Amino acid sequence: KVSEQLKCCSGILKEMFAKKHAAYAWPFYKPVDVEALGLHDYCDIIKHPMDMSTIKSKLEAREYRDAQEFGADVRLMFSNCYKYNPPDHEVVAMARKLQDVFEMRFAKMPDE
Ligand SMILES: COc1cc2c(cc1-c1c(C)noc1C)[nH]c1ccnc(-c3c(C4CC4)n[nH]c3C)c12
């Protein structure tokens, strides 16, 4: 059950990195570079940054013991985006689209 769940997690993350979703996924590929983007309030607002490359590294290191922990990091990544940015920002619209990709497939997680 757990190994199967973690293969589903790995599949979902590989899809989120696929070219077909890249026009909206790309801001989530790497950690937010606070200095490069001039976001001098980012760390005052976001206490736990997360991004897709960090999630990939944690899967590769077998840090997630089950799908719930993996899902919590994916949601943390999106929640940080919804917390920091104005609700009408282009990046929030991109987040909603990538989160729909994620939620619809994560809902199909094997359950036994
Ligand atoms: C505005 O939010 C981001 C922009 C970029 C990013 C992360 C975020 C981000 C996420 C996710 N959640 O919160 C924040 C903050 N990472 C990049 C790397 C390079 N350029 C860009 C870029 C963009 C992106 C289309 C939105 N607009 N203008 C530039 C300079 C970004």
Short mmCIF file of N, CA and C in Angstrom, two decimals, residues 13-112:
data_model
loop_
_atom_site.label_atom_id
_atom_site.label_comp_id
_atom_site.label_asym_id
_atom_site.label_seq_id
_atom_site.Cartn_x
_atom_site.Cartn_y
_atom_site.Cartn_z
N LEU A 13 4.07 14.15 -9.24
CA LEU A 13 5.06 15.19 -9.30
C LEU A 13 5.73 15.23 -10.68
N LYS A 14 6.01 14.08 -11.27
CA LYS A 14 6.57 14.05 -12.62
C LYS A 14 5.61 14.71 -13.62
N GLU A 15 4.30 14.45 -13.50
CA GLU A 15 3.34 15.15 -14.35
C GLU A 15 3.39 16.66 -14.11
N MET A 16 3.49 17.09 -12.85
CA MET A 16 3.52 18.53 -12.61
C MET A 16 4.74 19.20 -13.24
N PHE A 17 5.84 18.46 -13.44
CA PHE A 17 7.03 18.95 -14.13
C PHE A 17 6.96 18.76 -15.65
N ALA A 18 5.89 18.15 -16.20
CA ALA A 18 5.86 17.86 -17.63
C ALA A 18 5.64 19.09 -18.46
N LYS A 19 6.09 19.04 -19.71
CA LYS A 19 5.99 20.18 -20.59
C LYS A 19 4.56 20.62 -20.80
N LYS A 20 3.61 19.71 -20.81
CA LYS A 20 2.23 20.11 -21.04
C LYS A 20 1.68 21.08 -19.99
N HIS A 21 2.25 21.09 -18.77
CA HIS A 21 1.78 22.01 -17.73
C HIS A 21 2.74 23.15 -17.48
N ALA A 22 3.80 23.26 -18.26
CA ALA A 22 4.88 24.17 -17.94
C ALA A 22 4.50 25.62 -17.99
N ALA A 23 3.51 26.01 -18.81
CA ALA A 23 3.18 27.42 -18.91
C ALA A 23 2.63 27.98 -17.61
N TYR A 24 2.04 27.13 -16.77
CA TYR A 24 1.54 27.56 -15.46
C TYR A 24 2.34 26.97 -14.32
N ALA A 25 3.08 25.87 -14.52
CA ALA A 25 3.81 25.27 -13.40
C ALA A 25 5.14 25.93 -13.12
N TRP A 26 5.75 26.56 -14.13
CA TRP A 26 7.14 26.96 -13.98
C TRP A 26 7.47 27.84 -12.78
N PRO A 27 6.63 28.73 -12.25
CA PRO A 27 7.06 29.49 -11.07
C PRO A 27 7.23 28.63 -9.83
N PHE A 28 6.68 27.42 -9.82
CA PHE A 28 6.73 26.51 -8.69
C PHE A 28 7.87 25.53 -8.79
N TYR A 29 8.65 25.54 -9.87
CA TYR A 29 9.71 24.55 -10.03
C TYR A 29 10.79 24.65 -8.99
N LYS A 30 11.18 25.85 -8.59
CA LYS A 30 12.33 26.09 -7.73
C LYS A 30 11.96 26.96 -6.58
N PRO A 31 12.76 26.98 -5.51
CA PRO A 31 12.46 27.89 -4.41
C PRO A 31 12.29 29.33 -4.87
N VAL A 32 11.39 30.05 -4.23
CA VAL A 32 11.26 31.48 -4.47
C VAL A 32 12.60 32.14 -4.12
N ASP A 33 13.19 32.84 -5.07
CA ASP A 33 14.45 33.53 -4.82
C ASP A 33 14.10 34.96 -4.41
N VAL A 34 14.06 35.16 -3.12
CA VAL A 34 13.62 36.40 -2.51
C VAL A 34 14.47 37.58 -2.98
N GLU A 35 15.78 37.40 -3.02
CA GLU A 35 16.67 38.51 -3.43
C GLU A 35 16.51 38.82 -4.92
N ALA A 36 16.45 37.78 -5.76
CA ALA A 36 16.32 37.99 -7.21
C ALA A 36 15.01 38.64 -7.61
N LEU A 37 13.90 38.32 -6.91
CA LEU A 37 12.59 38.86 -7.25
C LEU A 37 12.26 40.15 -6.47
N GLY A 38 13.14 40.56 -5.56
CA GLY A 38 12.95 41.76 -4.74
C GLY A 38 11.80 41.66 -3.75
N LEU A 39 11.55 40.46 -3.24
CA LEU A 39 10.43 40.23 -2.33
C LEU A 39 10.93 40.32 -0.89
N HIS A 40 11.20 41.53 -0.46
CA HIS A 40 11.84 41.77 0.82
C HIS A 40 10.96 41.47 2.02
N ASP A 41 9.65 41.25 1.83
CA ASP A 41 8.72 40.86 2.89
C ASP A 41 8.41 39.37 2.85
N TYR A 42 8.96 38.63 1.89
CA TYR A 42 8.55 37.23 1.73
C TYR A 42 8.78 36.41 2.99
N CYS A 43 9.95 36.51 3.58
CA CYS A 43 10.26 35.71 4.76
C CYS A 43 9.56 36.17 6.01
N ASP A 44 9.03 37.39 6.04
CA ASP A 44 8.23 37.84 7.16
C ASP A 44 6.85 37.22 7.09
N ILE A 45 6.40 36.88 5.90
CA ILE A 45 5.06 36.34 5.66
C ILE A 45 5.07 34.83 5.61
N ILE A 46 6.07 34.23 4.97
CA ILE A 46 6.15 32.79 4.77
C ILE A 46 7.20 32.19 5.68
N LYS A 47 6.78 31.37 6.61
CA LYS A 47 7.71 30.75 7.55
C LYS A 47 8.27 29.44 7.03
N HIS A 48 7.56 28.76 6.12
CA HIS A 48 7.98 27.45 5.63
C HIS A 48 7.90 27.40 4.13
N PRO A 49 8.92 27.89 3.42
CA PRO A 49 8.87 27.86 1.95
C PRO A 49 8.83 26.45 1.42
N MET A 50 8.23 26.26 0.26
CA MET A 50 8.23 24.95 -0.38
C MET A 50 8.11 25.13 -1.87
N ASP A 51 8.65 24.18 -2.64
CA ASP A 51 8.66 24.23 -4.10
C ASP A 51 8.78 22.81 -4.62
N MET A 52 8.57 22.65 -5.93
CA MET A 52 8.55 21.30 -6.51
C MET A 52 9.90 20.58 -6.52
N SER A 53 10.99 21.31 -6.62
CA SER A 53 12.32 20.66 -6.62
C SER A 53 12.67 20.19 -5.22
N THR A 54 12.25 20.92 -4.20
CA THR A 54 12.44 20.46 -2.83
C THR A 54 11.59 19.20 -2.61
N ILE A 55 10.34 19.20 -3.08
CA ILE A 55 9.50 18.02 -2.92
C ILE A 55 10.14 16.83 -3.65
N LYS A 56 10.65 17.04 -4.86
CA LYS A 56 11.33 15.97 -5.57
C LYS A 56 12.50 15.41 -4.76
N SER A 57 13.32 16.27 -4.20
CA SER A 57 14.46 15.81 -3.41
C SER A 57 14.02 15.01 -2.19
N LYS A 58 12.93 15.41 -1.55
CA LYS A 58 12.42 14.69 -0.38
C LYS A 58 11.89 13.32 -0.81
N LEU A 59 11.21 13.21 -1.96
CA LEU A 59 10.79 11.89 -2.46
C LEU A 59 11.98 11.03 -2.77
N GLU A 60 12.99 11.59 -3.42
CA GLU A 60 14.18 10.82 -3.77
C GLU A 60 14.90 10.32 -2.53
N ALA A 61 14.91 11.10 -1.45
CA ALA A 61 15.53 10.70 -0.19
C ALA A 61 14.62 9.82 0.65
N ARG A 62 13.42 9.48 0.19
CA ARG A 62 12.44 8.65 0.90
C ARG A 62 12.02 9.33 2.21
N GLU A 63 12.01 10.67 2.22
CA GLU A 63 11.63 11.39 3.42
C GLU A 63 10.14 11.27 3.70
N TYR A 64 9.30 11.21 2.67
CA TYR A 64 7.87 11.08 2.89
C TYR A 64 7.56 9.63 3.20
N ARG A 65 6.91 9.40 4.32
CA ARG A 65 6.61 8.02 4.70
C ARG A 65 5.31 7.55 4.12
N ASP A 66 4.46 8.47 3.65
CA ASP A 66 3.19 8.13 3.02
C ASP A 66 2.72 9.30 2.19
N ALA A 67 1.60 9.09 1.50
CA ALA A 67 1.07 10.13 0.64
C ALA A 67 0.58 11.34 1.37
N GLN A 68 0.14 11.21 2.61
CA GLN A 68 -0.39 12.37 3.31
C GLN A 68 0.70 13.42 3.54
N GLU A 69 1.89 12.99 3.88
CA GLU A 69 2.99 13.89 4.12
C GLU A 69 3.41 14.58 2.82
N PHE A 70 3.47 13.82 1.72
CA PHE A 70 3.76 14.40 0.41
C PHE A 70 2.69 15.44 0.06
N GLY A 71 1.42 15.09 0.20
CA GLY A 71 0.34 16.01 -0.10
C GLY A 71 0.40 17.29 0.71
N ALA A 72 0.80 17.17 1.97
CA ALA A 72 0.90 18.35 2.83
C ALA A 72 1.95 19.31 2.30
N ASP A 73 3.07 18.82 1.76
CA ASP A 73 4.07 19.74 1.21
C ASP A 73 3.58 20.37 -0.08
N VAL A 74 2.87 19.62 -0.92
CA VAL A 74 2.35 20.21 -2.15
C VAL A 74 1.37 21.33 -1.80
N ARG A 75 0.49 21.07 -0.84
CA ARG A 75 -0.47 22.08 -0.41
C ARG A 75 0.20 23.24 0.27
N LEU A 76 1.25 22.99 1.04
CA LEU A 76 2.03 24.09 1.64
C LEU A 76 2.57 25.02 0.56
N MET A 77 3.11 24.46 -0.50
CA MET A 77 3.59 25.26 -1.62
C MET A 77 2.50 26.18 -2.19
N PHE A 78 1.31 25.61 -2.45
CA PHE A 78 0.23 26.43 -2.96
C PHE A 78 -0.28 27.43 -1.93
N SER A 79 -0.42 27.02 -0.69
CA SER A 79 -0.90 27.93 0.35
C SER A 79 0.04 29.12 0.55
N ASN A 80 1.36 28.89 0.42
CA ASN A 80 2.29 30.01 0.54
C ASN A 80 2.03 31.02 -0.57
N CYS A 81 1.77 30.53 -1.78
CA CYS A 81 1.50 31.38 -2.90
C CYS A 81 0.20 32.19 -2.67
N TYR A 82 -0.84 31.53 -2.15
CA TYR A 82 -2.11 32.20 -1.88
C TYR A 82 -1.98 33.18 -0.73
N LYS A 83 -1.10 32.92 0.22
CA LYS A 83 -0.90 33.84 1.35
C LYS A 83 -0.15 35.10 0.94
N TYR A 84 0.92 34.94 0.17
CA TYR A 84 1.81 36.04 -0.12
C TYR A 84 1.30 36.99 -1.18
N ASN A 85 0.73 36.47 -2.25
CA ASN A 85 0.38 37.27 -3.42
C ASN A 85 -1.01 37.82 -3.37
N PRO A 86 -1.26 38.98 -4.03
CA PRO A 86 -2.63 39.46 -4.12
C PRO A 86 -3.50 38.43 -4.86
N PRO A 87 -4.78 38.30 -4.50
CA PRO A 87 -5.62 37.25 -5.09
C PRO A 87 -5.83 37.33 -6.61
N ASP A 88 -5.63 38.50 -7.21
CA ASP A 88 -5.79 38.68 -8.66
C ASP A 88 -4.45 38.60 -9.39
N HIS A 89 -3.34 38.23 -8.70
CA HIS A 89 -2.04 38.12 -9.35
C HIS A 89 -2.04 36.94 -10.32
N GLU A 90 -1.30 37.08 -11.42
CA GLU A 90 -1.15 36.05 -12.43
C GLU A 90 -0.64 34.75 -11.79
N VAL A 91 0.28 34.84 -10.80
CA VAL A 91 0.83 33.63 -10.21
C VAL A 91 -0.25 32.86 -9.42
N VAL A 92 -1.25 33.55 -8.87
CA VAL A 92 -2.31 32.87 -8.15
C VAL A 92 -3.21 32.10 -9.14
N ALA A 93 -3.48 32.70 -10.31
CA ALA A 93 -4.23 31.98 -11.33
C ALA A 93 -3.45 30.73 -11.79
N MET A 94 -2.12 30.84 -11.90
CA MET A 94 -1.29 29.70 -12.29
C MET A 94 -1.33 28.63 -11.20
N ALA A 95 -1.22 29.04 -9.93
CA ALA A 95 -1.33 28.13 -8.81
C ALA A 95 -2.64 27.37 -8.84
N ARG A 96 -3.76 28.06 -9.09
CA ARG A 96 -5.04 27.36 -9.09
C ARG A 96 -5.10 26.30 -10.17
N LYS A 97 -4.50 26.58 -11.33
CA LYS A 97 -4.49 25.61 -12.41
C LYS A 97 -3.62 24.43 -12.09
N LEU A 98 -2.44 24.67 -11.56
CA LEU A 98 -1.57 23.54 -11.20
C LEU A 98 -2.14 22.77 -10.02
N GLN A 99 -2.78 23.46 -9.08
CA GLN A 99 -3.39 22.75 -7.96
C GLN A 99 -4.57 21.90 -8.43
N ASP A 100 -5.29 22.32 -9.46
CA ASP A 100 -6.34 21.46 -10.00
C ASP A 100 -5.74 20.21 -10.61
N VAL A 101 -4.64 20.34 -11.35
CA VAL A 101 -3.95 19.17 -11.88
C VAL A 101 -3.62 18.23 -10.73
N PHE A 102 -3.00 18.76 -9.69
CA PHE A 102 -2.62 17.97 -8.54
C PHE A 102 -3.81 17.33 -7.83
N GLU A 103 -4.82 18.12 -7.47
CA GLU A 103 -5.92 17.58 -6.67
C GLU A 103 -6.70 16.52 -7.41
N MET A 104 -6.93 16.70 -8.73
CA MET A 104 -7.72 15.72 -9.44
C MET A 104 -7.00 14.39 -9.49
N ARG A 105 -5.69 14.36 -9.61
CA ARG A 105 -4.96 13.12 -9.68
C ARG A 105 -4.65 12.57 -8.30
N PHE A 106 -4.33 13.42 -7.33
CA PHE A 106 -4.10 12.97 -5.96
C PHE A 106 -5.35 12.31 -5.39
N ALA A 107 -6.54 12.74 -5.85
CA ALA A 107 -7.79 12.12 -5.41
C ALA A 107 -7.87 10.66 -5.83
N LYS A 108 -7.12 10.26 -6.85
CA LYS A 108 -7.12 8.87 -7.33
C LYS A 108 -6.08 8.01 -6.59
N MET A 109 -5.50 8.50 -5.51
CA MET A 109 -4.50 7.77 -4.74
C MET A 109 -4.99 6.36 -4.45
N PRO A 110 -4.17 5.31 -4.66
CA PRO A 110 -4.60 3.96 -4.24
C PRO A 110 -4.92 3.98 -2.74
N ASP A 111 -6.02 3.31 -2.33
CA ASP A 111 -6.45 3.39 -0.92
C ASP A 111 -6.31 2.04 -0.18
N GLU A 112 -5.64 1.07 -0.79
CA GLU A 112 -5.34 -0.21 -0.15
C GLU A 112 -4.16 -0.88 -0.86
#
